[PDB]
Design a protein around this ligand. Structure first.
Ligand SMILES: Nc1ncnc2c1ncn2[C@@H]1O[C@H](COP(=O)(O)OP(=O)(O)O)[C@@H](O)[C@H]1O
Ligand code: VO4
Ligand SMILES: [Mg+2]
Length: 650
């Protein structure tokens, strides 16, 4: 087809899709838009990620070779080495577009050209890489959109020294979908590790844990009714994780310490409750499970039981519902903590505190998703994709253009459709979705329903937000509300939004765990999830705006994981809401590089005959000014080549 869309004959959305479909059908996943990498999920292995390929793109310039993920990594690395500044790769795409795999191809590259033979160098490399399979086991799950699906945001920072060697790395994780442990969409599956452990551990360790090799045997796992995935090999996979556990310094001592907690969560899920017609209170039925759970958690079986059936020196009995609620709340707290622990545990072996040096961050977040029923989790994941989208725009389209005028470079303002910072605004500060939901949590009387009314009244005079009430549209359920995201409309069900945002665990349950003798358990137990995630995101965004950007934009080829197939409409939608066309457009009318003035002077003199300098150097080198415009403080050079010229002459 045609690499880099700026070279499209006729710059039109249709042309764009035609070119993209053409490439994809012939296994040409990658295409450029000038430094930006556009990739289309192949849904099958393409033998193009071999070390030889790594060697092929290493050092080379973007034009010397076919568009490839590596060219981006190579630029990021070289730039870091050169300017000695921090780089960051922001990868975007819906769920299943292929962000997780791309972020790994990027590391593979860096963690290789970066080392050499240096066994020490490639040693830590081995560690940074093994961290992926490890976290993937506890943070990924098979949703309906993706068999792998990352259920947590991740920002991986590659640490190098001035010389350019891998010295370490630190991982930053974002709000995990812990609710997936106790309940999920039928057809879907819980976190991998659970299934893999059940088919990986020896019948010995299994019995010591009170477990039976069979997912159906457990409540939490049985619910969604799905225990296998043609795509995944649980048994064989578990062996990999365990290797990784050791490569990261988690001997069979730690491994077992972890296994217990997972086994405990599994047992907790089988605890049933009965009407304790004795006073009336509620009591545990499937006692043996309650025994096994307390057995693994290494705590007093009784204290536990009492924590599940009463509140708090005064103990108020609770119904079969509040009991089941607390049961699930406990399981969720355990996993969330265990996961957060696991990352810091890794960060301990990987994060270099000694040396200080340049860093290359890689962003891998949960992509935009829409299901039959969307709840609190989806709102956050999507909100997070909204922010990321807002960032691309602020950089890639708004920023670049806004300069062209500010410098005074005759510019035909190319209007990038939706600016979308309005979908953020509708959910961050005073009088915003999560801010209302937050403040509504304070009023001990309000309920999910009363909250919906706030939103519906406070807004709906504001686009992006609809409801059956105001916009008399039956599509919106009676307990739901429509949100017009940048990537399409989504309908959230307010049910459970309060207790989800409250995110509370009663002291009785906490104390019942602290009372554990297992060093790990008690280790796990030594401001609304919403407002908190809101901070994490704003923090993340300010840090990404402190590095040199490199963009990768993944496009989901189709919703059936079909290799070599394009979903015309579906892909056309993405291409549109992403603003890729308004990119090729800008890239055209615009100029390749806009090198500042004083930076040209104190750099390109030798070529020159002995902002005044700027001009002189060009005139004495002949270059159609229809290729360069003089700015108030920066110079502009339309095409790449007419810039390679000067630089290839040094
Ligand atoms: N480059 C690729 N080569 C082979 N399979 C791929 C590639 N990119 C994505 N996939 C397939 O798509 C699935 C989903 O990709 P993934 O990276 O997990 O998406 P995301 O991170 O955006 O949810 C993968 O686990 C894999 O089966
Ligand atoms: O399914 V993915 O976009 O990792 O979330
Ligand atoms: Mg993923």
């Amino acid at each position: 087809g045609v690499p880099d869309f700026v070279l499209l004959n006729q710059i039109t959305e249709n042309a764009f899709i035609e070119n993209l479909t053409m490439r994809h059908k012939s296994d040409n996943i990658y295409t450029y838009i000038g430094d930006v990498v556009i990739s289309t999920n192949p849904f099958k292995n393409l033998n193009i990620y071999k070390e030889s390929d790594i060697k092929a793109y290493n050092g080379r310039y973007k034009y010397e070779m076919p568009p490839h993920m590596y060219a981006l990594a190579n630029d990021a690395y070289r730039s870091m080495r050169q300017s000695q500044e921090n780089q960051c790769v922001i990868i975007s795409g819906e769920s299943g577009a292929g962000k997780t795999e791309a972020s790994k191809k990027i590391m593979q590259f860096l963690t290789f050209v970066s080392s050499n033979q240096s066994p020490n160098g490639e040693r830590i490399s081995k560690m940074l890489l093994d961290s992926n399979p490890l976290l993937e086991a506890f943070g990924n799950a098979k949703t309906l959109r993706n068999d792998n699906s990352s259920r947590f945001g991740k920002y991986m920072e590659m640490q190098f020294n001035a010389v350019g060697s891998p010295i370490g790395g630190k991982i930053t994780n974002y709000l995990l979908e812990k609710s997936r442990v106790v309940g999920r969409t039928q057809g879907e599956r819980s976190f991998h590790i659970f299934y893999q452990m059940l088919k990986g551990l020896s019948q010995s360790k299994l019995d010591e844990l009170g477990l039976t090799p069979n997912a159906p045997a457990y409540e939490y796992l049985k619910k969604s009714g799905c225990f296998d995935v043609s795509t995944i090999d649980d048994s064989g996979e578990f062996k990999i994780i365990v290797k990784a556990m050791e490569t990261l310094g988690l001997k069979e001592s730690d491994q077992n310490s972890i296994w217990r907690i997972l086994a405990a969560i599994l047992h907790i899920g089988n605890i049933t409750f009965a009407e304790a017609a004795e006073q009336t209170t509620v009591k545990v039925s499937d006692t043996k499970s309650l025994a096994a759970a307390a057995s693994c958690l290494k705590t007093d079986q009784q204290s536990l039981s009492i924590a599940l059936c009463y509140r708090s020196v005064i103990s108020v009995p609770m119904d079969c519902n509040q009991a089941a609620y607390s049961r699930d709340a406990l399981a969720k707290a355990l996993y969330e903590r265990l996961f957060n622990w696991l990352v810091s545990k890794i960060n301990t072996i990987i994060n270099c505190t000694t040396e200080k040096g340049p860093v290359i961050g890689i962003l891998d977040i949960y992509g935009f998703e829409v299901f039959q029923n969307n709840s609190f989790e989806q709102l956050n994941i999507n909100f997070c994709n909204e922010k990321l989208q807002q960032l691309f725009i602020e950089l890639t389209l708004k920023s670049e253009q806004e300069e062209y005028v500010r410098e005074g470079i005759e510019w035909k303002n190319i209007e990038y459709f939706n600016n979308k910072p309005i979908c953020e605004l509708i959910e961050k500060k005073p009088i915003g979705l999560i801010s209302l939901l937050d403040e509504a949590c304070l009023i001990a009387k309000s309920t999910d329903q009363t909250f919906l009314d706030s939103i519906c009244k406070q807004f709906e005079k504001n686009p992006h937000l609809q409801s059956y009430v105001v916009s008399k549209d039956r599509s919106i359920g009676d307990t739901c509300f429509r949100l017009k995201h940048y990537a399409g409309d989504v309908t959230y069900d307010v049910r459970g939004f309060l207790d989800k945002n409250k995110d509370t665990l009663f002291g009785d349950l906490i104390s019942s765990m602290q009372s554990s003798s297992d060093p790990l358990v008690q280790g796990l137990f030594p401001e609304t999830a919403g407002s908190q995630f809101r901070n994490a995101m704003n923090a993340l965004i300010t840090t990404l705006l402190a590095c040199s950007p490199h963009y990768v934009r993944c496009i989901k080829s189709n919703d059936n994981k079909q290799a070599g197939v394009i979903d015309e409409d579906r892909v056309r939608h993405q291409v549109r809401y992403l603003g890729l066309l308004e990119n090729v457009r800008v890239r055209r009318a615009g100029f390749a590089g806009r090198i500042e003035y004083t930076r040209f002077y104190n750099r390109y003199k030798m070529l020159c005959k002995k902002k005044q300098a700027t001009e002189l150097i060009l005139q004495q080198h002949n270059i159609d000014k229809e290729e360069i415009r003089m700015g108030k403080t920066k110079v502009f050079i339309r095409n790449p080549t007419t810039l390679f010229y000067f630089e290839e002459k040094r």
